């Protein structure tokens, strides 16, 4: 979306505002969606003052007096086209404008031209009127509002897509329609009328998810417009619901709180639902602007920017207490009529440029160069950094995030002045009987408690699902986490740590409404917390958890009495329930069994909920079953306020406290663990793991996950979904409350009747004999291999292993249903033709060794199919057929292949773009038949690449531009799609750099990837790959591999339905993977809706894998996944046997497509109907699986148009296509040309100069071009101005740009200069915006002014000046030299693991804000550290004429001084930190 406010302040109303708000509306086209039309818009609206001029002639022409300014108050409302239904309407609105004592003046129709909408838009199109009010006993401004409000609230409990109030005040209007947004002035004409007047605009255009247009949707609303997505919604509109009921505020009536009476819903979205929540603490009395506050509030913790400030930080103290943040991405926008403004997300995930002049008329809005202000008398040119706001006040005053947030600092104070006034071992068995597993104690808490950090592993979960396994399972195994992909991001949680935060207050909430002066650091709390606790605020029922057997007979009881005994404890007046299995200290054989506290925490949290008391108590869960930092995520995540695992706790003590291991701390495991360094590591490494998870959704704080439910259940009924955890997800709905029974039975059973020794093993890590099974198995993969080494019985074996496995997938319920007599394997297509169909799919070559990595794509490349790059980059020498072999089957270019032929290439048909952007690089980009963007990966969603140091040998070091050394963690985020709008972006950059190439989009199955995917295909993209939660890695958390992702049955369907339903199904082809390895994986997925098929694991496995699985550790015995040479050496593996392997893997479709009987796999996809459900098996833990979300696909057998694709989606006329037109094209193929060309920019002007590169760059890759084009450019530059720019590049901004200058930069420079008609000081003024330099691989870039967020975000070798920058300057940073001459946001170092960075930060303040965990802050002490920053800050003065630039030079012997220097530990001893 685009959202932006203009305001007036010394003029009064013009119509002039009102045409530049329409014209920007304009230029934030590209940020917003249409719909299946490609013609009506996703919306576009306004919001302005009322246009008390234009509505004269309405009085006028009835002969009427016109009421005062603030006692009038204009309904724009909605209503039904059939007129008896519009008659039924309007009497409606009227009885209730009655209802309250007001009276009606009558309607304005409000004249439109229908004949622009598009056909869907005005097909849907309500009939638009303005009903005309007053109040007969003078009734005026704030309560007139307050009572339409009540009014507009009442009619908003009919709310219908053909009956809705887009506004009801006597101060604010709202125009808005399901239009593209230079058409909302063309329907409506009042917007073009001028009579027209505002002495402001509050403007929205938008982009969603779907192609079917509801009008009330649009978006500015009644008081806000939203840009950007909730993370959080389940939970804030929980902790919403909950405040419902027992609202008290001045003289605001029982009667009329109730009347509102949901003010929050969930079947409404985020936006509706903030603007709603927002208004009721406006009308309320808070101005918008604290309201925000309240409900988005900044990250207050470390932040310098607060030194002077303490009273906001003890409003958020106290406010934290009480409200937990809307989460998620935000820009906002909001008037009240009386105050217009806008503020971020705690994290600034929305760009918001605003500019001032010096009659103070303001413009804020999502991109800079957008209503067009005379250059010369422009007074500021700034930006919101995280969590700032910035408004006006109708006293003709601007108000920057300071007063402002102070202004509500002063009042209801108490703010900090209330603040400040609030032995045998049995062991081994309890926990058996809890469900702890030798390998969850060895492989898990033990590593916790010893490292300190929950334990990396490697390849895919292959074992099957909690729910469809013979082992007992917790009821944790059940839920999936959720996470972030397109539509918002993923927040890096070490890297950004300091925005996080894991309180968790323990007292009741009270009114949010009424401020009255009338704490746990993290929710783990040890055993002496939890006494501490039960001294505190309040006494604290202790609730059997446990319950005795046969009398009270069944965990259904147990149930019904825990939340009985639960609500009536919390009615007598208890504010912590402490949930005990453990109660009055200790759990028998005749306590015959447990309630599992997950399942606990959620029925007393949702019958709480239905009881109208959630918010009296709030619950600590004192379990042993709890371990897993996944564990801690479900019980916070339904509903626990804090944990205390006690067992997990004591399972250190014992381990530690026991002889085999305190001997191995002697000599060979760490002895540097007294006993409270075990344990402070077994929490601290389960705090690292919430931080994880929530940074996997992008959530902050602890606090908004606690409501929400951050998951998706695979496996449970719906009955027990209802009881315990409302609202989720569970389409496939297996379990009982008697089936979750059994299974605490089955683990209960062995601790207790029998004996006790040590845990039982399932192999659930690793392949056992015992345990449990494994898509692959080490004895499995040795036959597999030698089968395809070959060109037997192998297959017998490797098939048979096949045929013994349990149920482990949805597909497994599964079987064919012909519908078409059998066929004959000479009528099926050919095995060449399918393979075309298959994909190596991405494995990065960091992560495998260059051997295992180059063979797959000589094989891929043979079969005619496609290889991926995975996420390192790749080696030029690879983009290169072969010349050189020879009869041994060998070549002088890639010596350590083998079993090469002459024509045989290397180099990968898809070129992965990943958050790190390693190789990522202009010829990169330009060898690729495709691109794929990583959103995410199914073994690790909400997380980055991941590649340890010992692998980071010289050659990947080289590759990915970074260091020999260090560890490479990639950003959860792209730090470039913060949004679907911002997905589109990067779509178009790379069309705009290879037109030709098709551009994927990888997301990973979970519930919510259909919308996701609507959004992507709308967002321009050609491929759409779903992977499931089942895919390999060579590195991951186990949590993860465990605990993150959903069934590929569930994403495949879910997006092949979608995209169908919302008629984008033809713009996009689906690749599906994880875990397929066989012919009817590949028509499982085909019928499901897929038509490419994706082999990561088992292509391994065919090269010689073993399931050794050891990845992370650079072991390989055998070759694949190592970097070291002995083991490379011992890489057996040649193209001939994956090349067969997919041979065969096809034969066994071909012959599928005969039992079906159709000719060709372009026959069956999403053929849904021809699947039904198998009639043999019997899982152990339930009677069966509802298949409706698998089998209920829209009918296939005669559309099947979708299956028909455009070659690549094209980014359109752009205006590198004219600049590719002059006497250009002679710089470029002779070979040194100087050319100048001069342009005009406007903000449309996206990836400018972009494809110019792509095109030098596909004829004399990155650094063969020895011409000079000097492109000059003039205005506000749209997004990724100058991305992937070459060396013999040269680009002027006159101007200002937007985001993401630079993205990607490669060689040449980019000199960016505030239009010289300033009369405003450059370095104090704002220029460039967030993400600019985005891995640049090279280049220079020179900027006047201060840039945005993320300055350099993963620069590996891209040099610049700017003048100064907000936060996370240099994030990921990892070679180059970076100058800063001005102030610069805090974390100002996070993993930035090579390269110079120089500041000049005069405050002093600098080295508080600095991330100190990697980065170490100097002074300028090295004489050519020195000759360094002149040079550079010299080459700054040459390009542009810098102002804070000239200075520091001709007074270079003082600034020099006090003005730090950021060296990583990497650089120590370099001619320029040192002598
Ligand atoms: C060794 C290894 C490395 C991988 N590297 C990447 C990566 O660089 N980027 C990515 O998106 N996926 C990566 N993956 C996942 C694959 O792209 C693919 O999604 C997955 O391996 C398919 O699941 P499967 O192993 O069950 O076939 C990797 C997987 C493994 C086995
Ligand atoms: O090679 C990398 O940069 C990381 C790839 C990754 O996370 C994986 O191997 O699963
Ligand atoms: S599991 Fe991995 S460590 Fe080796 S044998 Fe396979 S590549």
Same mark, same amino acid.
């Given at each position: 979306?685009?959202?932006?406010?203009?305001?007036?302040?010394?003029?009064?109303?013009?119509?002039?505002?009102?045409?530049?708000?329409?014209?920007?509306?304009?230029?934030?086209?590209?940020?917003?969606?249409?719909?299946?039309?490609?013609?009506?818009?996703?919306?576009?609206?306004?919001?302005?003052?009322?246009?008390?001029?234009?509505?004269?002639?309405?009085?006028?022409?009835?002969?009427?007096?016109?009421?005062?300014?603030?006692?009038?108050?204009?309904?724009?409302?909605?209503?039904?086209?059939?007129?008896?239904?519009?008659?039924?309407?309007?009497?409606?609105?009227?009885?209730?404008?009655?209802?309250?004592?007001?009276?009606?003046?009558?309607?304005?129709?409000?004249?439109?031209?229908?004949?622009?909408?598009?056909?869907?838009?005005?097909?849907?199109?309500?009939?638009?009127?303005?009903?005309?009010?007053?109040?007969?006993?003078?009734?005026?401004?704030?309560?007139?509002?307050?009572?339409?409000?009540?009014?507009?609230?009442?009619?908003?409990?009919?709310?219908?897509?053909?009956?809705?109030?887009?506004?009801?005040?006597?101060?604010?209007?709202?125009? #808005?329609?399901?239009?593209?947004?230079?058409?909302?002035?063309?329907?409506?004409?009042?917007?073009?009328?001028?009579?027209?007047?505002?002495?402001?605009?509050?403007?929205?255009?938008?982009?969603?998810?779907?192609?079917?247009?509801? $009008?009330?949707?649009?978006?500015?609303?009644?008081?806000?417009?939203?840009?950007?997505?909730?993370?959080?919604?389940?939970?804030?509109?929980?902790?919403?619901?909950?405040?419902?009921?027992?609202?008290?505020?001045?003289?605001?009536?029982?009667?009329?709180?109730?009347?509102?009476?949901?003010?929050?819903?969930?079947?409404?979205?985020?936006?509706?639902?903030?603007?709603?929540?927002?208004?009721?603490?406006?009308?309320?009395?808070?101005?918008?602007?604290?309201?925000?506050?309240?409900?988005?509030?900044?990250?207050?913790?470390?932040?310098?920017?607060?030194?002077?400030?303490?009273?906001?930080?003890?409003?958020?103290?106290?406010?934290?207490?009480?409200?937990?943040? $809307?989460?998620?991405?935000?820009?906002?926008?909001?008037?009240?009529?009386?105050?217009?403004?806008?503020?971020?997300?705690?994290?600034?995930?929305?760009?918001?440029?605003?500019?001032?002049?010096?009659?103070?008329?303001?413009?804020?809005?999502?991109?800079?160069?957008?209503?067009?202000?005379?250059?010369?008398?422009?007074?500021?040119?700034?930006?919101?950094?995280?969590?700032?706001?910035?408004?006006?006040?109708?006293?003709?005053?601007?108000?920057?995030?300071?007063?402002?947030?102070?202004?509500?600092?002063?009042?209801?104070?108490?703010?900090?002045?209330?603040?400040?006034?609030?032995?045998?071992?049995?062991?081994?068995?309890?926990?058996?009987?809890?469900?702890?597993?030798?390998?969850?104690?060895?492989?898990?808490?033990?590593?916790?408690?010893?490292?300190?950090?929950?334990?990396?592993?490697?390849?895919?979960?292959?074992?099957?699902?909690?729910?469809?396994?013979?082992?007992?399972?917790?009821?944790?195994?059940?839920?999936?986490?959720?996470?972030?992909?397109?539509?918002?991001?993923?927040?890096?949680?070490?890297?950004?740590?300091?925005?996080?935060?894991?309180?968790?207050?323990?007292?009741?909430?009270?009114?949010?409404?009424?401020?009255?002066?009338?704490?746990?650091?993290?929710?783990?709390?040890?055993?002496?917390?939890?006494?501490?606790?039960?001294?505190?605020?309040?006494?604290?029922?202790?609730?059997?958890?446990?319950?005795?057997?046969?009398?009270?007979?069944?965990?259904?009881?147990?149930?019904?009495?825990?939340?009985?005994?639960?609500?009536?404890?919390?009615?007598?007046?208890?504010?912590?329930?402490?949930?005990?299995?453990?109660?009055?200290?200790?759990?028998?054989?005749?306590?015959?069994?447990?309630?599992?506290?997950?399942?606990?925490?959620?029925?007393?949290?949702?019958?709480?909920?239905?009881?109208?008391?959630?918010?009296?108590?709030?619950?600590?869960?004192?379990?042993?079953?709890? $371990?897993?930092?996944?564990?801690?995520?479900?019980?916070?995540?339904?509903?626990?306020?804090?944990?205390?695992?006690?067992?997990?706790?004591?399972?250190?003590?014992?381990?530690?406290?026991?002889? #085999?291991?305190?001997?191995?701390?002697?000599?060979?495991?760490?002895?540097?663990?007294?006993?409270?360094?075990?344990?402070?590591?077994?929490?601290?490494?389960?705090?690292?793991?919430?931080?994880?998870?929530?940074?996997?959704?992008?959530?902050?704080?602890?606090?908004?996950?606690?409501?929400?439910?951050?998951?998706?259940?695979?496996?449970?009924?719906?009955?027990?979904?209802?009881?315990?955890?409302?609202?989720?997800?569970?389409?496939?709905?297996?379990?009982?409350?008697?089936?979750?029974?059994?299974?605490?039975?089955?683990?209960?059973?062995?601790?207790?009747?029998?004996?006790?020794? #040590?845990?039982?093993?399932?192999?659930?890590?690793?392949?056992?004999?015992?345990?449990?099974?494994?898509?692959?198995?080490?004895?499995?993969?040795?036959?597999?291999?030698?089968?395809?080494?070959?060109?037997?019985?192998?297959?017998?074996?490797?098939?048979?292993?096949?045929?013994?496995?349990?149920?482990?997938?949805?597909?497994?319920?599964?079987?064919?249903?012909?519908?078409?007599?059998?066929?004959? *394997?000479?009528?099926?297509?050919?095995?060449?033709?399918?393979?075309?169909?298959?994909?190596?799919?991405?494995?990065?070559?960091?992560?495998?060794?260059?051997?295992?990595?180059?063979?797959?794509?000589?094989?891929?490349?043979?079969?005619?199919?496609?290889?991926?790059?995975?996420?390192?980059?790749?080696?030029?020498?690879?983009?290169?057929?072969?010349?050189?072999?020879?009869?041994?089957?060998?070549?002088?270019?890639?010596?350590?292949?083998?079993?090469?032929?002459?024509?045989?290439?290397?180099?990968?048909?898809?070129?992965?773009?990943?958050?790190?952007?390693?190789?990522?690089?202009?010829?990169?980009?330009?060898?690729?038949?495709?691109?794929?963007?990583?959103?995410?990966?199914?073994?690790?969603?909400?997380?980055?690449?991941?590649?340890?140091?010992?692998?980071?040998?010289?050659?990947?070091?080289?590759?990915?531009?970074?260091?020999?050394?260090?560890?490479?963690?990639?950003?959860?985020?792209?730090?470039?799609?913060?949004?679907?709008?911002?997905?589109?972006?990067?779509?178009?950059?790379?069309?705009?750099?290879?037109?030709?190439?098709?551009?994927?989009?990888?997301?990973?199955?979970?519930?919510?990837?259909?919308?996701?995917?609507?959004?992507?295909?709308?967002?321009?993209?050609?491929?759409?790959?779903?992977?499931?939660?089942? !895919?390999?890695?060579?590195?991951?958390?186990?949590?993860?591999?465990?605990?993150?992702?959903?069934?590929?049955?569930?994403?495949?369907?879910?997006?092949?339905?979608?995209?169908?339903?919302?008629?984008?199904?033809?713009?996009?082809?689906?690749?599906?993977?994880?875990?397929?390895?066989?012919?009817?994986?590949?028509?499982?997925?085909?019928?499901?809706?897929?038509?490419?098929?994706?082999?990561?694991?088992?292509?391994?496995?065919?090269?010689?894998?073993?399931?050794?699985?050891?990845?992370?550790?650079?072991?390989?015995?055998?070759?694949?996944?190592?970097?070291?040479?002995?083991?490379?050496?011992?890489?057996?593996?040649?193209?001939?046997?994956?090349?067969?392997?997919?041979?065969?893997?096809?034969?066994?479709?071909?012959?599928?497509?005969?039992?079906?009987?159709?000719?060709?796999?372009?026959?069956?996809?999403?053929?849904?109907?021809?699947?039904?459900?198998?009639?043999?098996?019997?899982?152990?833990?339930?009677?069966?699986?509802?298949?409706?979300? *698998?089998?209920?696909?829209?009918?296939?057998?005669?559309?099947?148009?979708?299956?028909?694709?455009?070659?690549?989606?094209?980014?359109?006329?752009?205006?590198?296509?004219?600049?590719?037109?002059?006497?250009?094209?002679?710089?470029?193929?002779?070979?040194?040309?100087?050319?100048?060309?001069?342009?005009?920019?406007?903000?449309?002007?996206?990836?400018?100069?972009?494809?110019?590169?792509?095109?030098?760059?596909?004829?004399?890759?990155?650094?063969?071009?020895?011409?000079?084009?000097?492109?000059?450019?003039?205005?506000?530059?749209?997004?990724?101005?100058?991305?992937?720019?070459?060396?013999?590049?040269?680009?002027?901004?006159?101007?200002?740009?937007?985001?993401?200058?630079?993205?990607?930069?490669?060689?040449?420079?980019?000199?960016?200069?505030?239009?010289?008609?300033?009369?405003?000081?450059?370095?104090?003024?704002?220029?460039?915006?967030?993400?600019?330099?985005?891995?640049?691989?090279?280049?220079?870039?020179?900027?006047?002014?201060?840039?945005?967020?993320?300055?350099?975000?993963?620069?590996?070798?891209?040099?610049?000046?700017?003048?100064?920058?907000?936060?996370?300057?240099?994030?990921?940073?990892? !070679?180059?030299?970076?100058?800063?001459?001005?102030?610069?946001?805090?974390?100002?170092?996070?993993?930035?693991?090579?390269?110079?960075?120089?500041?000049?930060?005069?405050?002093?303040?600098?080295?508080?804000?600095?991330?100190?965990?990697?980065?170490?802050?100097?002074?300028?002490?090295?004489?050519?550290?020195?000759?360094?920053?002149?040079?550079?800050?010299?080459?700054?003065?040459?390009?542009?004429?810098?102002?804070?630039?000239?200075?520091?030079?001709?007074?270079?012997?003082?600034?020099?001084?006090?003005?730090?220097?950021?060296?990583?530990?990497?650089?120590?001893?370099?001619?320029?930190?040192?002598?």
């Amino acid at each position: 979306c685009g959202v932006g406010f203009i305001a007036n302040l010394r003029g009064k109303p013009d119509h002039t505002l009102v045409e530049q708000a329409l014209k920007a509306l304009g230029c934030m086209e590209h940020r917003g969606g249409c719909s299946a039309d490609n013609d009506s818009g996703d919306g576009a609206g306004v919001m302005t003052a009322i246009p008390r001029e234009l509505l004269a002639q309405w009085f006028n022409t009835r002969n009427l007096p016109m009421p005062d300014g603030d006692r009038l108050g204009v309904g724009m409302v909605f209503l039904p086209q059939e007129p008896s239904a519009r008659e039924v309407a309007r009497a409606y609105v009227e009885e209730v404008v009655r209802l309250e004592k007001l009276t009606v003046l009558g309607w304005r129709e409000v004249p439109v031209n229908s004949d622009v909408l598009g056909i869907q838009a005005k097909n849907n199109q309500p009939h638009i009127e303005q009903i005309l009010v007053t109040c007969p006993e003078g009734c005026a401004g704030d309560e007139l509002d307050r009572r339409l409000y009540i009014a507009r609230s009442i009619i908003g409990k009919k709310l219908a897509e053909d009956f809705y109030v887009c506004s009801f005040s006597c101060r604010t209007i709202v125009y #808005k329609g399901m239009v593209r947004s230079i058409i909302l002035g063309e329907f409506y004409l009042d917007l073009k009328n001028p009579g027209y007047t505002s002495n402001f605009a509050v403007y929205h255009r938008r982009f969603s998810t779907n192609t079917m247009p509801k $009008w009330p949707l649009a978006q500015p609303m009644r008081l806000l417009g939203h840009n950007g997505e909730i993370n959080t919604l389940l939970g804030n509109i929980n902790w919403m619901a909950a405040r419902e009921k027992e609202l008290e505020v001045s003289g605001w009536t029982k009667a009329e709180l109730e009347a509102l009476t949901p003010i929050v819903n969930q079947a409404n979205s985020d936006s509706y639902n903030l603007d709603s929540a927002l208004e009721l603490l406006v009308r309320t009395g808070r101005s918008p602007l604290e309201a925000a506050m309240i409900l988005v509030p900044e990250a207050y913790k470390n932040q310098p920017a607060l030194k002077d400030y303490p009273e906001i930080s003890d409003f958020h103290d106290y406010y934290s207490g009480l409200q937990e943040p $809307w989460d998620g991405p935000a820009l906002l926008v909001f008037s009240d009529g009386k105050i217009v403004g806008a503020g971020l997300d705690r994290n600034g995930l929305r760009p918001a440029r605003y500019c001032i002049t010096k009659d103070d008329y303001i413009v804020l809005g999502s991109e800079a160069g957008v209503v067009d202000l005379p250059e010369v008398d422009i007074v500021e040119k700034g930006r919101l950094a995280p969590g700032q706001m910035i408004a006006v006040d109708l006293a003709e005053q601007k108000i920057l995030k300071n007063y402002q947030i102070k202004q509500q600092a002063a009042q209801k104070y108490p703010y900090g002045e209330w603040i400040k006034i609030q032995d045998a071992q049995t062991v081994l068995q309890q926990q058996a009987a809890f469900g702890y597993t030798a390998e969850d104690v060895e492989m898990v808490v033990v590593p916790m408690a010893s490292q300190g950090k929950e334990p990396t592993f490697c390849m895919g979960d292959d074992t099957p699902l909690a729910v469809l396994s013979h082992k007992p399972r917790l009821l944790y195994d059940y839920f999936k986490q959720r996470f972030a992909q397109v539509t918002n991001p993923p927040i890096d949680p070490l890297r950004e740590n300091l925005v996080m935060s894991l309180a968790m207050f323990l007292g009741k909430r009270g009114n949010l409404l009424e401020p009255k002066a009338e704490k746990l650091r993290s929710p783990l709390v040890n055993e002496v917390e939890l006494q501490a606790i039960k001294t505190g605020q309040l006494q604290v029922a202790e609730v059997s958890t446990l319950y005795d057997l046969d009398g009270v007979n069944s965990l259904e009881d147990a149930l019904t009495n825990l939340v009985k005994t639960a609500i009536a404890t919390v009615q007598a007046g208890a504010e912590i329930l402490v949930l005990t299995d453990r109660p009055n200290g200790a759990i028998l054989t005749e306590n015959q069994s447990f309630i599992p506290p997950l399942l606990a925490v959620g029925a007393v949290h949702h019958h709480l909920i239905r009881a109208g008391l959630r918010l009296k108590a709030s619950l600590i869960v004192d379990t042993a079953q709890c $371990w897993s930092t996944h564990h801690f995520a479900c019980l916070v995540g339904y509903g626990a306020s804090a944990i205390c695992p006690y067992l997990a706790l004591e399972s250190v003590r014992q381990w530690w406290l026991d002889e #085999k291991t305190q001997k191995l701390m002697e000599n060979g495991r760490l002895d540097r663990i007294d006993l409270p360094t075990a344990l402070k590591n077994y929490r601290q490494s389960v705090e690292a793991g919430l931080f994880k998870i929530l940074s996997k959704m992008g959530i902050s704080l602890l606090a908004s996950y606690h409501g929400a439910q951050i998951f998706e259940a695979i496996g449970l009924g719906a009955e027990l979904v209802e009881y315990a955890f409302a609202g989720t997800t569970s389409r496939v709905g297996g379990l009982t409350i008697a089936d979750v029974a059994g299974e605490v039975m089955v683990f209960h059973g062995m601790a207790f009747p029998e004996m006790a020794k #040590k845990l039982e093993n399932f192999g659930f890590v690793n392949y056992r004999p015992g345990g449990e099974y494994h898509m692959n198995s080490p004895e499995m993969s040795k036959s597999l291999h030698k089968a395809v080494a070959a060109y037997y019985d192998h297959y017998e074996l490797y098939r048979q292993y096949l045929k013994d496995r349990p149920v482990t997938a949805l597909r497994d319920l599964l079987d064919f249903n012909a519908d078409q007599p059998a066929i004959s *394997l000479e009528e099926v297509e050919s095995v060449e033709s399918i393979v075309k169909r298959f994909c190596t799919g991405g494995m990065s070559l960091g992560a495998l060794s260059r051997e295992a990595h180059e063979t797959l794509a000589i094989a891929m490349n043979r079969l005619g199919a496609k290889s991926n790059s995975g996420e390192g980059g790749e080696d030029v020498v690879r983009y290169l057929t072969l010349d050189d072999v020879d009869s041994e089957g060998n070549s002088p270019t890639l010596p350590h292949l083998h079993g090469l032929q002459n024509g045989d290439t290397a180099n990968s048909a898809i070129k992965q773009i990943a958050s790190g952007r390693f190789g990522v690089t202009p010829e990169y980009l330009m060898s690729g038949k495709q691109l794929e963007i990583k959103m995410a990966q199914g073994a690790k969603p909400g997380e980055g690449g991941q590649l340890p140091g010992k692998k980071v040998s010289e050659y990947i070091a080289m590759l990915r531009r970074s260091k020999p050394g260090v560890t490479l963690i990639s950003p959860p985020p792209h730090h470039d799609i913060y949004s679907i709008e911002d997905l589109a972006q990067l779509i178009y950059d790379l069309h705009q750099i290879n037109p030709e190439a098709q551009v994927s989009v990888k997301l990973v199955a979970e519930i919510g990837i259909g919308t996701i995917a609507a959004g992507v295909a709308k967002a321009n993209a050609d491929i759409i790959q779903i992977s499931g939660h089942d !895919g390999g890695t060579g590195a991951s958390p186990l949590s993860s591999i465990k605990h993150a992702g959903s069934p590929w049955e569930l994403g495949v369907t879910e997006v092949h339905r979608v995209l169908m339903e919302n008629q984008l199904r033809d713009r996009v082809l689906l690749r599906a993977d994880g875990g397929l390895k066989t012919g009817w994986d590949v028509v499982m997925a085909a019928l499901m809706g897929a038509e490419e098929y994706g082999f990561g694991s088992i292509a391994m496995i065919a090269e010689g894998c073993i399931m050794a699985r050891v990845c992370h550790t650079n072991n390989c015995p055998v070759g694949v996944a190592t970097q070291q040479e002995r083991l490379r050496q011992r890489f057996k593996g040649v193209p001939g046997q994956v090349v067969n392997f997919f041979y065969f893997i096809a034969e066994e479709v071909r012959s599928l497509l005969a039992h079906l009987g159709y000719r060709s796999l372009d026959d069956i996809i999403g053929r849904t109907d021809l699947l039904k459900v198998r009639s043999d098996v019997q899982l152990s833990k339930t009677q069966n699986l509802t298949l409706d979300c *698998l089998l209920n696909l829209p009918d296939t057998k005669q559309n099947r148009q979708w299956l028909n694709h455009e070659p690549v989606h094209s980014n359109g006329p752009v205006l590198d296509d004219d600049i590719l037109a002059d006497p250009d094209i002679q710089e470029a193929i002779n070979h040194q040309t100087t050319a100048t060309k001069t342009y005009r920019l406007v903000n449309t002007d996206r990836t400018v100069g972009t494809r110019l590169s792509g095109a030098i760059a596909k004829k004399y890759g990155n650094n063969g071009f020895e011409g000079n084009i000097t492109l000059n450019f003039q205005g506000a530059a749209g997004q990724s101005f100058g991305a992937f720019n070459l060396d013999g590049m040269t680009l002027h901004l006159q101007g200002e740009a937007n985001d993401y200058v630079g993205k990607g930069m490669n060689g040449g420079e980019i000199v960016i200069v505030p239009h010289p008609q300033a009369s405003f000081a450059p370095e104090d003024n704002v220029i460039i915006g967030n993400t600019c330099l985005y891995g640049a691989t090279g280049g220079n870039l020179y900027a006047n002014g201060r840039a945005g967020e993320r300055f350099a975000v993963r620069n590996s070798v891209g040099k610049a000046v700017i003048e100064g920058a907000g936060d996370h300057c240099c994030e990921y940073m990892t !070679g180059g030299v970076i100058v800063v001459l001005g102030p610069v946001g805090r974390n100002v170092g996070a993993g930035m693991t090579g390269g110079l960075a120089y500041f000049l930060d005069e405050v002093g303040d600098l080295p508080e804000k600095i991330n100190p965990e990697i980065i170490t802050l100097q002074r300028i002490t090295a004489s050519k550290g020195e000759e360094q920053l002149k040079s550079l800050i010299t080459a700054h003065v040459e390009h542009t004429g810098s102002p804070k630039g000239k200075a520091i030079l001709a007074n270079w012997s003082d600034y020099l001084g006090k003005f730090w220097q950021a060296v990583p530990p990497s650089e120590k001893d370099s001619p320029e930190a040192n002598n």
